[PDB]
Amino acid sequence: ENNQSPYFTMPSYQGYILESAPVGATISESLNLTTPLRIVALDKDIEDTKDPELHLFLNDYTSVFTVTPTGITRYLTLLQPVDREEQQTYTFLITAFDGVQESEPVVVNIRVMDANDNAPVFDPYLPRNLSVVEEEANAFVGQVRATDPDAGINGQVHYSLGNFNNLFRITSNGSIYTAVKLNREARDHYELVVVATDGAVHPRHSTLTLYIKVLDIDDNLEH
């Protein structure tokens, strides 16, 4: 009949999932997101090689993760999209039940791996209408800043220019300077494309357009 408590074959479980993973995805056993986490529950009332027909259940995160419902070997699958930028680690217990007695609970930890799922976002408060005086190389034009909430290289931001790359320079902290002496009598305005690109292997970028006005030096004072 049913006098032996079911039990898991390992003392704990560590899982890994990429945040971009679709609902339905199986949780992996290692950080390389290859082979699955296998959760095996046995019960000595049942001859080996036979499915002990156990009920496995989680103590928390029951809207986020579920266990496959049959089999000697069970897997964990995603119920809803996860987000590393909101929560990176899940910890909960799983328990097996044979209809009469429970197993000891086992601790499961899952790490959500980062996807490069965010582009840099420009700070919307830094001015986009800028001025600079003509006839001065290395003159400060303006400041931009972008931040990227992804992890490590996926969240590191690099700046470049999308146009006028012989006229302006941008620094690694978002400061724009003239490369050369501007000349208002040649052109009094520049619509400068600034690019913020992350450090990902598969990079993402964003752009901003800056409205630069060239200020006059009275022509009587230009040498």
Angle at CA of residue 51, ends 49 and 52, nearest 5°: 115
Decide: is 113 part of the binding site for Na ion (CB under 5 A): no
Binding residue for Na ion (CB under 5 A) from 18, 26, 46, 85? 85
Min separation Cβ 148 and Na ion, Å: 11
Min separation Cβ 19 and Na ion, Å: 5
Burial 105-133 (b: 16+ CB within 10 A, else e): ebebebbbbbbbbbbbebeeeeebebebe
Tokens read off for 223:
């040498």
Contacted entry of Ca ion, Na ion, none for residue 108, CB cut-off 5 to 8 Å set by kind:
none
SS3 155: helix
Q: Which residues contact 157 (CB under 8 A, 6 or more apart)?
A: 120, 146, 147, 148, 196, 197, 198, 199
Nearer to Na ion, 85 or 188 (CB): 85
Decide: is 117 part of the binding site for Na ion (CB under 5 A): yes
Contacted entry of Ca ion, Na ion, none for residue 83, CB cut-off 5 to 8 Å set by kind:
Na ion
Site for Na ion in 128-167 (CB under 5 A): none
Decide: is 87 part of the binding site for Na ion (CB under 5 A): no
Q: Cα separation of 154 and 149, whole Å?
A: 8
Nearer to Na ion, 55 or 205 (CB): 205
Decide: is 45 part of the binding site for Na ion (CB under 5 A): no
SS3 181: coil
Binding site for Na ion (CB under 5 A): 83, 85, 117
